[model samples]
Target: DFTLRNARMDDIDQIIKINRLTLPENYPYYFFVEHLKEYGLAFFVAIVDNSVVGYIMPRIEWGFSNIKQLPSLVRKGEVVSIAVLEEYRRKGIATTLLEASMKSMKNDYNAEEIYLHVRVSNYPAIALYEKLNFKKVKVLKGYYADGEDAYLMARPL
Candidate 1:
């Protein structure tokens, strides 16, 4: 079994380690800290047996809608990062972490919607997001440094 909770300053190192172990798009240490410091409520971690096994970090921002065609700006949440340890996944840890963070983004931060960029070839991740009602809004060409494209998926809160 696992549990979900807000990420703490002390958990930064473990979070970084998980990021590197699970995803290719790694970020600097300070980037994670800044997100935790600014919007901690939306930063969640999944703990199993007293250790961090997964996490999600979505920061509130002002941006154009990924769904609507109107030329107006809106408050939104961008899922900067999310991952579950390889062996710890498929047990619904990632889903729980995402659900909690999305709730925080809408209820606590007043985000109109939430969005994320995922590699087009990542079928498992794409399926999970689609199950949560995230639609593919657009395709970002060469969104990754490796020249792979990304699906800009989004869902309204």
Candidate 2:
């Protein structure tokens, strides 16, 4: 069984390795450090023999709603990045990592909702979000650096 745990500084390298293998939008090393320092509890990883199989990084912010933009700012969490190895897909590791992060965001940070941007081309990722009851609230054109569009998906905690 894979162990799901709050990420520690020691896990950063393995986490990045998984990210490199699974995602196109590579994040700077410092970005991972910054987010982990800010909200480490919300950053989770699935580990097997000290190797990372999947991970999710979420950060809280005060922003206009993804559900609606009619009023004052709210404390919300955005899943900045998440990925699992290709061989690990469909095993529920991604879902488990997300649920751990989402629970921390809601219980620890008091975020009212959570949102994420998924590339339109990523049908599998989008499908998972939908399975978790996240709704597409907006479509962002050219959201990815590669000129791909993204769906801004959201769901209330």
Residue pairs clashing in model 1 are none
lDDT of 2 by residue, 96-134 (tens): 999999999999999999999999979999999999989
Identify the candidate with maximal lDDT.
1
Name the weakest run of 10 consecutive residues (lDDT summed) in model 1. Answer: 64-73
- Return the TM-score for candidate 1, rounded to 2 decimals: 0.98
RMSD of each: 0.7, 1.0
Candidate topping TM-score: 1
Alpha-carbon deviation at 147 in model 2, angstroms: 0.9
Q: List candidate 2 stretches off by more than 4 Å.
A: none
Q: Count backbone overlaps in model 2.
A: 0
Off by over 4 Å in 1: none
